[PDB]
Design a protein around this ligand. Structure first.
Ligand SMILES: O[C@H](c1cc(C(F)(F)F)nc2c(C(F)(F)F)cccc12)[C@@H]1CCCCN1
Lengths: 131, 386, 62
RNA sequence: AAUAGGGUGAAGCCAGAGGAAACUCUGGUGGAGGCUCGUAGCGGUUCUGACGUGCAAAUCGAUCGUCGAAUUUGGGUAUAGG
RNA sequence: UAACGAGAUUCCCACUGUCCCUAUCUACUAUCUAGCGAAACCACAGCCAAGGGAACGGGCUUGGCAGAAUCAGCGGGGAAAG
RNA sequence: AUAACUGGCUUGUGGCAGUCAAGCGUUCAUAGCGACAUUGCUUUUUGAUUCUUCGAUGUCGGCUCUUCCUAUCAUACCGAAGCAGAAUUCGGUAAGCGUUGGAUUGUUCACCCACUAAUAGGGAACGUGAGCUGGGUUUAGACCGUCGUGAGACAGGUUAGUUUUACCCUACUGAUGAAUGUUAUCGCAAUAGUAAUUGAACUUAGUACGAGAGGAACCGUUCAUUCAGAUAAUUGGUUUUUGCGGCUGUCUGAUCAGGCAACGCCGCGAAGCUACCAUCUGCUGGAUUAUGGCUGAACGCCUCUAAGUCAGAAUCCAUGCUAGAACG
């Protein structure tokens, strides 16, 4: 439920990002991106605010070895906003959510991109600093 | 056998052959269709690509997430001093297409446009248009007869106009002469307008208004002979391939026992004629205005020129057109600006543009000042300042 | 449009110029160019970089 | 006839400590080995690199095995077509 | 089965243009010039579609067509060469 | 004269499609199916044959790339339902447009994970090796198992095993060019090509429909996917600007200033080039197919059809875009 402008993709399939919520996961390994069309040889890739299918590579055993949706909340690849600003974060991080976009954890450590907070109200609720 | 997997074709078959343009001046392939009820007006203009800049603008697009919020946008500056009208051509409708009936010229042509007709001007006797200038002897009935022929038989009337390239920083002395179709009014009205404008200047403000969507006709940047990988965007072959990898691996099946015209091949890249449409006019600047780059929010008395001049162009001391985005061609290229061929009622086409700020920092580096006065205020006194 | 200030060198940042850096501790740094951006990621001290505003105010120049 | 420079640190030997004894422990010294890192040398793993009417009827480049012995090599000499 | 292995294989950390997806730069070629100057190969030669045909034609039949001389590339064909 | 590829005749077998209509489908042969029979098509399977090639047509698969077929997976417009809505199934015009990222396997095939509007099937010497690669097979080394007295065999497993040449003709891609009195400028447009594509969110609307459960759509708005053509504002990349600075070894007696390290190394680095790693742009008219209609006979009624005629698809032809006939 939203229309965010195109952003430079930061996380191809196979990328491992940080897990920024208290859900108990420490890694989030991207294996697919929601909304990725067809193009030969092109890897699906995610930007901040994208829903992702991910596994927990490092974390609690009951969180490990499962496919689960996740949302990227910050990215280290610089991207341009429509106001001309190129910005980037120190790392790539995401949070575990439902298919509906509702978090599993209850807090987020670190800043959150405004594209993601503007696009996912629950992450905005559980988010602190939003840049 | 079929392809194992599908993929779209690399490149467009509608821009073949990828050869050099026959002329460097882009030619208007089609002019806007004539409506008699409109007033008599020009439909195109010739300018010179000066450079690119940056603006800040408040967006007026309801329903957008950037509505009423500032956007930073690339813009192009086109140096456009007024063109001089020197002639008029009549075209006749024939079962084989349009046919030029007669060309009538003005009595006096400037040296810059008369150099157009010479390859070695300095070695010439400069005889161009001298007998024709004598044709105006004390009654000009030959000229009146040709004009009457145009009124009687022509269905399409085009004027001949040339740029005043001496007002630009270019070292070229030849003017650029082009046919610009006249739209509006009857054929007699068009011929009268052309005659009354012989040897007269026509400014940009009489052809283009602000917020218009216009087309740009130009010859793109040349790249010379190019391989398939960059000419057509084909996939590079694996690293361990013998005899090289910037190739197309299979250029055809066994049958047809020929290479097809649709296979990507190495060849000349760039320097193509392109027509790019729907570029919005953010500003029609005036050359006499000393605050070209100033807006209603940035009251700095400031021209459009960056610090140190446009890189590899110079300063824009004339009237100019500020277009949104990028247009084909390189710096100093002559560009033909054409009015739109259709009526666009989309919100992007009908939006009224009010500029917030225009970038005039140096384009020759990471410029960080908008004005020498600002530079002096920031840095204070230097050693060279006594 | 408003003019920002380079966090490293103190130079004026005009719309679209330079980059925005968000540190892990949620602090926001603005660099007018890749020169000061590179010196910042190289951990240089602007008080010890002779052309920055911080150096010039520390040394009472101009 | 030839084979840089290092590492490791075997027997043997000196001193000290513990023990009733049988014996044990510690610090040096010493300089062994078809030991080891690595040059010249000898070889020829991979790039399935270059070249492939070649510089060359087997070479060139990087990478690599080994490098004090079952080592490398000159000359003399012996073995000759079922 | 400790040690050893330019032996075959699986996984993990580090690492990276292997890849997403490409871009840019350097020297030597290629290129153009003066001088020098080969070889493979060669029935005759050299534009296509269908037909029939030793059952996949450059030549035949029926059509499409067809305008000197050429340069750099290229690898579809000559069921190319060896 | 004769096997192992391609190709040719054939089409048993493989694949696909019809006709009849006993039955299934609460009733009800034909919404959707359809036994017993029976008529065909195809050459994407495998056989059969041995016509071409043994003074050699490089024999698997993958990568790359173009194009074609339609027996249509999606997208456009529609007809039918055991179609209330949503979903789904059957079908028509339709190949314009797309049809993916991966784990295992040398694999074709397969099988899962996941995204997606969809993850359709095929052809072009089972397309494509002077395009690559060489994992497999199928030379020579070696091991095992079974077989053999043995040398050795295995269509069984395993490991290592040189992939040569274009400078000719044509064809493709680009580039000049004699002569059509000379030269110069501005044009016309025959013909050839052609380009855009799909999705999501908001609104409509928790509305129509429905007992409820559930639950649409047109007009519109904002964005995005795949593709295309440009461009260098900005940001990023690149650095022989060897531009500025720094550092090591050595050499010029020291200093200054320099040489060399087969660009000595490092930071920044303008300019140029360049990236869905950046930004911009991608048109509107007519004629139709299926289909639904109007008037209207044949056949005093009826009937979209016979004459005439209306609307109407991602279709076609134009508009627009690219080239400009080097004998217009
Ligand atoms: O049996 C020899 C041989 C065969 C083959 C193969 F079967 F693979 F093609 N390859 C050979 C090779 C090869 F190049 F490694 F393939 C080298 C030497 C002899 C070979 C023959 C003997 C006649 C002369 C040519 N080589």
């Amino acid at each position: 439920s939203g229309n965010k402008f195109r952003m430079s993709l930061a996380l191809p399939v196979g990328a491992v990002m940080n897990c920024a919520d208290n859900s108990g996961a420490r890694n989030l390994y991207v294996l697919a991106v929601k909304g990725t069309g067809a193009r030969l040889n092109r890897l699906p890739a995610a930007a901040a605010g994208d829903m992702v299918m991910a596994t927990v590579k490092k974390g609690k055993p009951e969180l490990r070895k499962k496919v689960m949706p996740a949302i990227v909340i910050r990215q280290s690849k610089p991207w341009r906003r429509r106001d001309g600003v190129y910005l980037y974060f120190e790392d790539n991080a995401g949070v575990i959510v439902n298919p509906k976009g509702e978090m599993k954890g209850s807090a987020i450590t670190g800043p959150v991109a405004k594209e993601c907070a503007d696009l996912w109200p629950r992450i905005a609720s559980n988010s602190g600093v939003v840049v | 056998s079929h392809r194992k997997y599908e993929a779209p074709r690399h490149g467009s078959l509608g821009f073949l052959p990828r050869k050099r343009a026959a002329k460097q001046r882009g030619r208007v392939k089609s002019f806007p269709k004539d409506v008699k009820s409109k007033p008599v007006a020009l439909t195109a203009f010739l300018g010179y690509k000066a450079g690119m800049t940056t603006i800040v603008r408040d967006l007026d697009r309801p329903g957008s997430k950037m509505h009423k919020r500032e956007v930073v946008e690339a813009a192009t500056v086109v140096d456009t001093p007024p063109m001089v009208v020197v002639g008029v051509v009549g075209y006749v409708e024939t079962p084989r297409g349009l046919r030029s009936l007669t060309t009538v010229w003005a009595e006096h042509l400037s040296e810059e446009v008369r150099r157009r007709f010479y390859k070695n001007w300095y070695k010439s006797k400069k005889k161009a248009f001298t007998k024709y200038s004598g044709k105006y002897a004390t009654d000009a009935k030959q000229v009146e007869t040709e004009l009457a022929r145009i009124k009687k038989y022509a269905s399409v009337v085009r004027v001949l106009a040339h740029t005043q390239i001496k007002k630009t920083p270019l070292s070229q002395k030849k003017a650029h002469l082009a046919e610009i179709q006249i739209n509006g009014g009857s054929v007699s009205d068009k011929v009268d307008w052309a005659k009354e404008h012989f040897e007269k200047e026509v400014s940009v403000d009489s052809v283009f208004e602000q917020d218009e969507m216009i087309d740009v006709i130009a010859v793109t940047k040349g790249h010379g002979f190019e391989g398939v990988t960059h000419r057509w965007g084909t996939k590079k072959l694996p690293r361990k391939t013998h005899r090289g990898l910037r190739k197309v691996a299979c250029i055809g099946a066994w049958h047809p026992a020929n290479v097809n015209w649709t296979v990507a091949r190495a060849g000349q890249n760039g320097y193509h004629h392109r027509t790019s449409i729907n570029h919005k006019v953010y500003r029609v600047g005036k050359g006499t205005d000393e605050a070209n780059g100033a807006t209603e929010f940035d009251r700095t008395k400031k021209t459009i020129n960056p610090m140190g001049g446009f890189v590899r162009y110079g300063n824009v001391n004339n009237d100019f057109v500020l277009l949104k985005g990028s247009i084909p061609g390189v710096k100093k290229r002559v560009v033909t600006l054409r009015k739109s061929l259709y009526v666009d009622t989309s919100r992007r086409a009908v939006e009224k543009v009010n500029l917030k700020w225009i970038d005039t920092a140096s384009r020759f580096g990471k410029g960080r000042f908008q004005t020498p006065a600002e530079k002096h205020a920031f840095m204070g006194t230097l050693k060279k300042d006594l | 449009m408003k003019i920002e200030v380079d966090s490293f060198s103190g130079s004026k940042i005009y719309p679209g110029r330079g980059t925005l850096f968000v540190r892990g501790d949620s602090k926001i740094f603005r660099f007018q160019s890749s020169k000061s951006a590179s010196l910042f990621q190289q951990r240089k001290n602007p008080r010890r970089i002779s052309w920055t505003v911080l150096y010039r105010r520390h040394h009472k120049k101009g």
